Design an enzyme around this catalytic site. Structure first.
Site, mmCIF file in Angstrom:
data_model
loop_
_atom_site.group_PDB
_atom_site.id
_atom_site.type_symbol
_atom_site.label_atom_id
_atom_site.label_comp_id
_atom_site.label_asym_id
_atom_site.label_seq_id
_atom_site.Cartn_x
_atom_site.Cartn_y
_atom_site.Cartn_z
ATOM 1 N N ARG A 192 3.448 42.893 46.230
ATOM 2 C CA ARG A 192 4.741 43.325 45.725
ATOM 3 C C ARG A 192 4.971 44.771 46.152
ATOM 4 N NH1 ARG A 192 1.493 40.870 42.921
ATOM 5 N NH2 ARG A 192 1.823 38.931 41.736
ATOM 6 N N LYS A 200 16.309 33.605 42.434
ATOM 7 C CA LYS A 200 15.827 33.897 41.087
ATOM 8 C C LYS A 200 15.995 35.373 40.690
ATOM 9 C CE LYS A 200 13.456 33.419 37.260
ATOM 10 N NZ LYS A 200 11.962 33.445 37.424
ATOM 11 N N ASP A 212 13.837 28.747 36.796
ATOM 12 C CA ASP A 212 12.421 28.701 37.149
ATOM 13 C C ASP A 212 11.861 27.431 36.520
ATOM 14 O OD1 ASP A 212 11.965 31.391 34.746
ATOM 15 O OD2 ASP A 212 12.407 29.255 34.444
ATOM 16 N N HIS A 259 10.378 27.024 34.122
ATOM 17 C CA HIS A 259 10.487 27.080 32.677
ATOM 18 C C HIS A 259 11.785 26.406 32.234
ATOM 19 C CE1 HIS A 259 8.954 28.639 28.898
ATOM 20 N NE2 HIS A 259 10.210 28.855 28.546
ATOM 21 N N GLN A 317 20.999 30.883 27.574
ATOM 22 C CA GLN A 317 19.656 30.605 28.053
ATOM 23 C C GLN A 317 18.636 31.491 27.326
ATOM 24 O OE1 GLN A 317 18.436 32.024 31.927
ATOM 25 N NE2 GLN A 317 17.477 30.057 32.437
ATOM 26 N N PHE A 351 15.246 30.255 25.318
ATOM 27 C CA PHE A 351 13.921 30.738 25.727
ATOM 28 C C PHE A 351 13.169 31.344 24.563
ATOM 29 C CE2 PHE A 351 14.901 31.683 30.435
ATOM 30 C CZ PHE A 351 14.570 30.358 30.755
#
Ligand code: CA
Length: 312
Positions: free
Chosen positions: A193, A238, A257, A259, A304, A308
């Site tokens: 990263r 994303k 994702d 998830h 969302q 979550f």
DNA sequence: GGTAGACCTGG
DNA sequence: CAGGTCTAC
């Protein structure tokens, strides 16, 4: 007493408040939920972090949100400083109204969200948000939080020190684009990263028009904004959706994702129509994202967050 | 033109 | 293997 992090009880005279019932905001549900990774509950029910280039401590009670800022010569937050806190929590956006709309069009939400009011999106800075989420690759909130923390300690401006905690503002573009930064970041454990942070800091500054470019995206449309960000190295669909949703004022963005897939197959029996692949994929994800935007409306991204949370 | 794989590192 | 991205099939 005048040392360390403050509490509503310890230094009463230095606090100001903003009318806000827990039904409109739940600090413990928003600050560590993975939107921002720079808030810490130093004292129980007291969150500290950098907001608007200054250190604040927030804590809520009944119908008030208590704020205290560490700029010398202390003094409760001023009219304008508290206003910054309001814009940061986008309080002008009433959750009572949104929960009503989503609940009236989605039975599952109706139930599920009853026990999780006060979940909302933070209005973050495009830079901090861009680079924080570039680091969320193959990671979890705990890992990401660590990386982002060392990253600011290393390249961000030193703000003030409370107890054994020194606060730093998020690094600037110039800093992240500097010489040997990638090498520095690798020592801080960012892994691969490290390359993206550096490559991305340089691209904005040397190929797109700098800060202004990024900022200007708040006025652009979600589709334009999304397209622009994807230009950056390390920024895909994303991450672009997260930046859009969290810093560029695009409430309809819905980051997808594995998830979101679980919440979709378990609470809606969702299935891909268009794209053939049954598992997640560029096309199936776009499709899933459209399903929720059609289902919840313009603020699909805010709904969302609510789910979550309840799924935790 | 859509789908495995490597890229860092650690729970 | 992981809340992703990029790139050579
Ligand atoms: Ca890209």
């Amino acid at each position: 007493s005048e040392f360390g992090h403050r509490t509503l009880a310890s230094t009463p005279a230095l606090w100001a408040s903003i009318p806000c019932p827990r039904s409109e905001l739940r600090l413990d549900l928003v600050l560590p939920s993975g939107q921002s990774f720079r808030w810490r509950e130093q004292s129980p029910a007291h969150w500290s972090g950098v907001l608007a280039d200054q250190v604040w401590t927030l804590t809520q009670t009944e119908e008030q949100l208590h704020c205290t800022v560490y700029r010398s010569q202390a003094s409760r937050p001023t009219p304008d400083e508290l206003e910054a806190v309001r814009k940061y929590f986008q309080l002008d956006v009433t959750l009572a109204q949104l929960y009503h709309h989503w609940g009236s069009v989605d039975s599952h939400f109706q139930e599920v969200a009853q026990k999780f009011q006060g979940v909302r999106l933070l209005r973050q800075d495009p830079i901090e948000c861009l680079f924080s989420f570039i680091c969320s690759s193959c990671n979890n909130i705990a890992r990401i939080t660590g990386m982002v923390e060392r990253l600011c300690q290393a390249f961000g401006p030193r703000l003030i020190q409370l107890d054994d905690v020194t606060y730093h503002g998020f690094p600037s573009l110039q800093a992240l684009a500097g010489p040997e930064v990638e090498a520095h970041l690798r020592k801080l454990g960012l892994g691969y990263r490290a390359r993206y942070v550096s490559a991305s800091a340089r691209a904005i500054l040397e190929e797109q028009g700098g800060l202004a470019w990024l900022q200007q995206l708040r006025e652009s449309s979600y589709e334009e904004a999304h397209k622009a960000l994807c230009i950056l190295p390390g920024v895909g669909t994303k991450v672009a959706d997260c930046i859009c949703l969290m810093a560029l004022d695009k409430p309809q963005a819905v980051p997808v994702d594995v998830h979101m897939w679980h919440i979709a197959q378990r609470d809606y029996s969702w299935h891909p129509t268009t794209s053939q692949a049954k598992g997640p994929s560029p096309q199936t994800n776009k499709e899933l994202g459209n399903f929720f935007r059609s289902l919840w409306g313009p603020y699909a991204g805010w709904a969302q967050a609510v789910l979550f949370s309840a799924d935790l």
